Amino acid sequence: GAGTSAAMRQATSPKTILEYIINFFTCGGIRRRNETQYQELIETMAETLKSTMPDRGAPLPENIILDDMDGCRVEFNLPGENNEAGQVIVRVSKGDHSETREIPLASFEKICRALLFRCE
């Protein structure tokens, strides 16, 4: 049967996916091959966020679960007031695979605000 749709999508590496996520929150909007791949990130995040948000501008969620990101589970962990790093811990995983990295809270949060505002 035709049940290799997610199996086709998952052909990418979870580390590679993590990297383009990092590249998005640092500088997203290149006009080579960036547009489509990152567009999927924009819409998936924008929708899952506004779905757990009242509308826009309010306190955005601390854990953003994206289990189906290129067949890879990624969990965005926003730091609390007692956290000394003040950075976002991104955790992408894929069965035997696991990858963890940090990005500035300023970058992730401002893009996530602008993403809710981009939806309007």
PDB file of N, CA and C in Angstrom, residues 34-97:
ATOM      1  N   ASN A  34      15.716  28.176   0.447  1.00  0.00           N
ATOM      2  CA  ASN A  34      15.376  28.425   1.857  1.00  0.00           C
ATOM      3  C   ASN A  34      13.855  28.579   2.036  1.00  0.00           C
ATOM      4  N   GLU A  35      13.210  29.121   0.990  1.00  0.00           N
ATOM      5  CA  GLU A  35      11.845  29.662   1.046  1.00  0.00           C
ATOM      6  C   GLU A  35      10.825  28.584   1.443  1.00  0.00           C
ATOM      7  N   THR A  36      10.816  27.462   0.699  1.00  0.00           N
ATOM      8  CA  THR A  36       9.840  26.366   0.877  1.00  0.00           C
ATOM      9  C   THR A  36      10.042  25.628   2.218  1.00  0.00           C
ATOM     10  N   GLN A  37      11.299  25.222   2.476  1.00  0.00           N
ATOM     11  CA  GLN A  37      11.678  24.415   3.658  1.00  0.00           C
ATOM     12  C   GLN A  37      11.358  25.156   4.968  1.00  0.00           C
ATOM     13  N   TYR A  38      11.702  26.449   4.978  1.00  0.00           N
ATOM     14  CA  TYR A  38      11.463  27.328   6.122  1.00  0.00           C
ATOM     15  C   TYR A  38       9.984  27.721   6.199  1.00  0.00           C
ATOM     16  N   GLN A  39       9.292  27.826   5.039  1.00  0.00           N
ATOM     17  CA  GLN A  39       7.843  28.165   4.987  1.00  0.00           C
ATOM     18  C   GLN A  39       7.022  27.131   5.767  1.00  0.00           C
ATOM     19  N   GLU A  40       7.392  25.852   5.591  1.00  0.00           N
ATOM     20  CA  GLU A  40       6.772  24.732   6.309  1.00  0.00           C
ATOM     21  C   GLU A  40       6.957  24.895   7.830  1.00  0.00           C
ATOM     22  N   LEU A  41       8.144  25.378   8.240  1.00  0.00           N
ATOM     23  CA  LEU A  41       8.442  25.702   9.652  1.00  0.00           C
ATOM     24  C   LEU A  41       7.511  26.844  10.133  1.00  0.00           C
ATOM     25  N   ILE A  42       7.393  27.936   9.319  1.00  0.00           N
ATOM     26  CA  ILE A  42       6.570  29.129   9.652  1.00  0.00           C
ATOM     27  C   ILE A  42       5.131  28.704   9.968  1.00  0.00           C
ATOM     28  N   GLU A  43       4.500  27.972   9.030  1.00  0.00           N
ATOM     29  CA  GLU A  43       3.069  27.632   9.116  1.00  0.00           C
ATOM     30  C   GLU A  43       2.807  26.611  10.236  1.00  0.00           C
ATOM     31  N   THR A  44       3.667  25.571  10.353  1.00  0.00           N
ATOM     32  CA  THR A  44       3.519  24.524  11.394  1.00  0.00           C
ATOM     33  C   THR A  44       3.571  25.147  12.809  1.00  0.00           C
ATOM     34  N   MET A  45       4.601  25.985  13.044  1.00  0.00           N
ATOM     35  CA  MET A  45       4.780  26.674  14.329  1.00  0.00           C
ATOM     36  C   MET A  45       3.655  27.699  14.573  1.00  0.00           C
ATOM     37  N   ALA A  46       3.384  28.573  13.581  1.00  0.00           N
ATOM     38  CA  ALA A  46       2.363  29.651  13.692  1.00  0.00           C
ATOM     39  C   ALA A  46       1.000  29.093  14.132  1.00  0.00           C
ATOM     40  N   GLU A  47       0.615  27.965  13.508  1.00  0.00           N
ATOM     41  CA  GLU A  47      -0.666  27.291  13.759  1.00  0.00           C
ATOM     42  C   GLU A  47      -0.699  26.645  15.159  1.00  0.00           C
ATOM     43  N   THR A  48       0.346  25.852  15.512  1.00  0.00           N
ATOM     44  CA  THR A  48       0.391  25.137  16.822  1.00  0.00           C
ATOM     45  C   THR A  48       0.463  26.131  18.008  1.00  0.00           C
ATOM     46  N   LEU A  49       1.096  27.294  17.757  1.00  0.00           N
ATOM     47  CA  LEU A  49       1.224  28.381  18.740  1.00  0.00           C
ATOM     48  C   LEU A  49      -0.129  29.061  18.958  1.00  0.00           C
ATOM     49  N   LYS A  50      -0.723  29.624  17.881  1.00  0.00           N
ATOM     50  CA  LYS A  50      -2.016  30.365  17.965  1.00  0.00           C
ATOM     51  C   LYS A  50      -3.158  29.452  18.473  1.00  0.00           C
ATOM     52  N   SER A  51      -2.991  28.129  18.274  1.00  0.00           N
ATOM     53  CA  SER A  51      -3.963  27.110  18.722  1.00  0.00           C
ATOM     54  C   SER A  51      -3.943  26.951  20.263  1.00  0.00           C
ATOM     55  N   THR A  52      -2.778  27.211  20.886  1.00  0.00           N
ATOM     56  CA  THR A  52      -2.609  27.183  22.366  1.00  0.00           C
ATOM     57  C   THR A  52      -2.472  28.621  22.941  1.00  0.00           C
ATOM     58  N   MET A  53      -2.596  29.632  22.058  1.00  0.00           N
ATOM     59  CA  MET A  53      -2.643  31.069  22.435  1.00  0.00           C
ATOM     60  C   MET A  53      -4.109  31.559  22.426  1.00  0.00           C
ATOM     61  N   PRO A  54      -4.473  32.620  23.230  1.00  0.00           N
ATOM     62  CA  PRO A  54      -5.779  33.309  23.091  1.00  0.00           C
ATOM     63  C   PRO A  54      -5.931  33.918  21.674  1.00  0.00           C
ATOM     64  N   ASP A  55      -5.020  34.849  21.294  1.00  0.00           N
ATOM     65  CA  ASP A  55      -4.938  35.373  19.913  1.00  0.00           C
ATOM     66  C   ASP A  55      -3.457  35.603  19.552  1.00  0.00           C
ATOM     67  N   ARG A  56      -2.887  36.718  20.083  1.00  0.00           N
ATOM     68  CA  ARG A  56      -1.564  37.277  19.681  1.00  0.00           C
ATOM     69  C   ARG A  56      -1.084  38.251  20.777  1.00  0.00           C
ATOM     70  N   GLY A  57       0.246  38.323  21.001  1.00  0.00           N
ATOM     71  CA  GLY A  57       0.848  39.320  21.919  1.00  0.00           C
ATOM     72  C   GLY A  57       0.930  38.863  23.379  1.00  0.00           C
ATOM     73  N   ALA A  58       0.025  37.949  23.768  1.00  0.00           N
ATOM     74  CA  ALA A  58      -0.022  37.341  25.114  1.00  0.00           C
ATOM     75  C   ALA A  58       1.235  36.438  25.369  1.00  0.00           C
ATOM     76  N   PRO A  59       1.509  35.967  26.644  1.00  0.00           N
ATOM     77  CA  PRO A  59       2.670  35.080  26.933  1.00  0.00           C
ATOM     78  C   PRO A  59       2.626  33.748  26.140  1.00  0.00           C
ATOM     79  N   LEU A  60       3.526  33.649  25.152  1.00  0.00           N
ATOM     80  CA  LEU A  60       3.711  32.447  24.306  1.00  0.00           C
ATOM     81  C   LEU A  60       4.121  31.196  25.147  1.00  0.00           C
ATOM     82  N   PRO A  61       3.718  29.941  24.714  1.00  0.00           N
ATOM     83  CA  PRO A  61       3.970  28.689  25.488  1.00  0.00           C
ATOM     84  C   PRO A  61       5.472  28.384  25.642  1.00  0.00           C
ATOM     85  N   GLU A  62       5.843  27.787  26.789  1.00  0.00           N
ATOM     86  CA  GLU A  62       7.246  27.529  27.139  1.00  0.00           C
ATOM     87  C   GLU A  62       7.757  26.257  26.446  1.00  0.00           C
ATOM     88  N   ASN A  63       6.877  25.261  26.261  1.00  0.00           N
ATOM     89  CA  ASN A  63       7.210  24.022  25.529  1.00  0.00           C
ATOM     90  C   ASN A  63       6.404  23.989  24.229  1.00  0.00           C
ATOM     91  N   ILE A  64       7.126  23.957  23.091  1.00  0.00           N
ATOM     92  CA  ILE A  64       6.529  23.825  21.754  1.00  0.00           C
ATOM     93  C   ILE A  64       6.886  22.426  21.224  1.00  0.00           C
ATOM     94  N   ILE A  65       5.889  21.530  21.218  1.00  0.00           N
ATOM     95  CA  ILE A  65       6.047  20.145  20.753  1.00  0.00           C
ATOM     96  C   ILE A  65       5.764  20.078  19.250  1.00  0.00           C
ATOM     97  N   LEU A  66       6.728  19.554  18.496  1.00  0.00           N
ATOM     98  CA  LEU A  66       6.589  19.285  17.055  1.00  0.00           C
ATOM     99  C   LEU A  66       7.135  17.874  16.764  1.00  0.00           C
ATOM    100  N   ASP A  67       6.282  16.870  16.993  1.00  0.00           N
ATOM    101  CA  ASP A  67       6.655  15.444  16.897  1.00  0.00           C
ATOM    102  C   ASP A  67       6.896  15.005  15.432  1.00  0.00           C
ATOM    103  N   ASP A  68       6.261  15.710  14.487  1.00  0.00           N
ATOM    104  CA  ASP A  68       6.177  15.288  13.065  1.00  0.00           C
ATOM    105  C   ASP A  68       7.093  16.126  12.151  1.00  0.00           C
ATOM    106  N   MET A  69       8.128  16.782  12.725  1.00  0.00           N
ATOM    107  CA  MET A  69       9.026  17.669  11.950  1.00  0.00           C
ATOM    108  C   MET A  69      10.065  16.838  11.201  1.00  0.00           C
ATOM    109  N   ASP A  70       9.734  16.478   9.940  1.00  0.00           N
ATOM    110  CA  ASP A  70      10.593  15.645   9.077  1.00  0.00           C
ATOM    111  C   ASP A  70      10.798  14.254   9.706  1.00  0.00           C
ATOM    112  N   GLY A  71       9.713  13.743  10.329  1.00  0.00           N
ATOM    113  CA  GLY A  71       9.730  12.465  11.051  1.00  0.00           C
ATOM    114  C   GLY A  71      10.580  12.500  12.319  1.00  0.00           C
ATOM    115  N   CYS A  72      10.873  13.721  12.807  1.00  0.00           N
ATOM    116  CA  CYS A  72      11.706  13.962  13.992  1.00  0.00           C
ATOM    117  C   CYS A  72      10.886  14.745  15.034  1.00  0.00           C
ATOM    118  N   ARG A  73      10.971  14.294  16.292  1.00  0.00           N
ATOM    119  CA  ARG A  73      10.346  14.951  17.447  1.00  0.00           C
ATOM    120  C   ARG A  73      11.288  16.049  17.962  1.00  0.00           C
ATOM    121  N   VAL A  74      10.860  17.313  17.856  1.00  0.00           N
ATOM    122  CA  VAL A  74      11.587  18.468  18.422  1.00  0.00           C
ATOM    123  C   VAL A  74      10.729  19.171  19.480  1.00  0.00           C
ATOM    124  N   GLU A  75      11.363  19.440  20.628  1.00  0.00           N
ATOM    125  CA  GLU A  75      10.758  20.089  21.786  1.00  0.00           C
ATOM    126  C   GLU A  75      11.551  21.365  22.099  1.00  0.00           C
ATOM    127  N   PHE A  76      10.905  22.524  21.913  1.00  0.00           N
ATOM    128  CA  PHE A  76      11.497  23.829  22.219  1.00  0.00           C
ATOM    129  C   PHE A  76      11.218  24.174  23.687  1.00  0.00           C
ATOM    130  N   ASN A  77      12.284  24.268  24.490  1.00  0.00           N
ATOM    131  CA  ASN A  77      12.207  24.558  25.935  1.00  0.00           C
ATOM    132  C   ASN A  77      12.668  25.999  26.216  1.00  0.00           C
ATOM    133  N   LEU A  78      11.707  26.858  26.577  1.00  0.00           N
ATOM    134  CA  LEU A  78      11.959  28.253  26.961  1.00  0.00           C
ATOM    135  C   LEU A  78      12.322  28.314  28.449  1.00  0.00           C
ATOM    136  N   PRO A  79      13.397  29.064  28.827  1.00  0.00           N
ATOM    137  CA  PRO A  79      13.905  29.080  30.208  1.00  0.00           C
ATOM    138  C   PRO A  79      13.010  29.892  31.164  1.00  0.00           C
ATOM    139  N   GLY A  80      13.056  29.500  32.430  1.00  0.00           N
ATOM    140  CA  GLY A  80      12.318  30.158  33.503  1.00  0.00           C
ATOM    141  C   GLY A  80      13.130  31.274  34.143  1.00  0.00           C
ATOM    142  N   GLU A  81      12.524  31.953  35.130  1.00  0.00           N
ATOM    143  CA  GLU A  81      13.151  33.090  35.835  1.00  0.00           C
ATOM    144  C   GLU A  81      14.384  32.651  36.658  1.00  0.00           C
ATOM    145  N   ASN A  82      14.398  31.386  37.124  1.00  0.00           N
ATOM    146  CA  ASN A  82      15.526  30.830  37.907  1.00  0.00           C
ATOM    147  C   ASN A  82      16.655  30.271  37.010  1.00  0.00           C
ATOM    148  N   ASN A  83      16.444  30.234  35.674  1.00  0.00           N
ATOM    149  CA  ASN A  83      17.457  29.742  34.708  1.00  0.00           C
ATOM    150  C   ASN A  83      18.522  30.830  34.473  1.00  0.00           C
ATOM    151  N   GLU A  84      19.804  30.448  34.624  1.00  0.00           N
ATOM    152  CA  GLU A  84      20.953  31.381  34.556  1.00  0.00           C
ATOM    153  C   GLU A  84      21.409  31.621  33.104  1.00  0.00           C
ATOM    154  N   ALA A  85      21.198  30.615  32.232  1.00  0.00           N
ATOM    155  CA  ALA A  85      21.595  30.687  30.812  1.00  0.00           C
ATOM    156  C   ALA A  85      20.766  31.727  30.045  1.00  0.00           C
ATOM    157  N   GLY A  86      19.453  31.772  30.352  1.00  0.00           N
ATOM    158  CA  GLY A  86      18.514  32.661  29.668  1.00  0.00           C
ATOM    159  C   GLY A  86      18.436  32.384  28.168  1.00  0.00           C
ATOM    160  N   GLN A  87      18.585  31.098  27.789  1.00  0.00           N
ATOM    161  CA  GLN A  87      18.603  30.650  26.383  1.00  0.00           C
ATOM    162  C   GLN A  87      17.600  29.511  26.187  1.00  0.00           C
ATOM    163  N   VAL A  88      17.169  29.344  24.937  1.00  0.00           N
ATOM    164  CA  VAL A  88      16.210  28.317  24.519  1.00  0.00           C
ATOM    165  C   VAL A  88      16.943  27.007  24.211  1.00  0.00           C
ATOM    166  N   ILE A  89      16.568  25.930  24.918  1.00  0.00           N
ATOM    167  CA  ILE A  89      17.151  24.594  24.712  1.00  0.00           C
ATOM    168  C   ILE A  89      16.249  23.828  23.728  1.00  0.00           C
ATOM    169  N   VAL A  90      16.743  23.638  22.499  1.00  0.00           N
ATOM    170  CA  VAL A  90      16.046  22.882  21.452  1.00  0.00           C
ATOM    171  C   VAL A  90      16.497  21.402  21.521  1.00  0.00           C
ATOM    172  N   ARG A  91      15.516  20.490  21.560  1.00  0.00           N
ATOM    173  CA  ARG A  91      15.754  19.042  21.713  1.00  0.00           C
ATOM    174  C   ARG A  91      15.076  18.278  20.570  1.00  0.00           C
ATOM    175  N   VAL A  92      15.842  17.936  19.523  1.00  0.00           N
ATOM    176  CA  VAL A  92      15.328  17.127  18.398  1.00  0.00           C
ATOM    177  C   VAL A  92      15.795  15.670  18.588  1.00  0.00           C
ATOM    178  N   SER A  93      14.931  14.714  18.236  1.00  0.00           N
ATOM    179  CA  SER A  93      15.149  13.283  18.474  1.00  0.00           C
ATOM    180  C   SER A  93      14.442  12.481  17.378  1.00  0.00           C
ATOM    181  N   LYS A  94      14.931  11.258  17.116  1.00  0.00           N
ATOM    182  CA  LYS A  94      14.439  10.426  16.016  1.00  0.00           C
ATOM    183  C   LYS A  94      14.856   8.960  16.259  1.00  0.00           C
ATOM    184  N   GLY A  95      14.142   8.306  17.195  1.00  0.00           N
ATOM    185  CA  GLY A  95      14.394   6.908  17.553  1.00  0.00           C
ATOM    186  C   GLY A  95      15.713   6.732  18.299  1.00  0.00           C
ATOM    187  N   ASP A  96      16.742   6.267  17.571  1.00  0.00           N
ATOM    188  CA  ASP A  96      18.118   6.103  18.095  1.00  0.00           C
ATOM    189  C   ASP A  96      18.839   7.464  18.149  1.00  0.00           C
ATOM    190  N   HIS A  97      18.369   8.405  17.312  1.00  0.00           N
ATOM    191  CA  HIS A  97      18.936   9.754  17.194  1.00  0.00           C
ATOM    192  C   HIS A  97      18.482  10.643  18.360  1.00  0.00           C
TER     193      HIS A  97
END
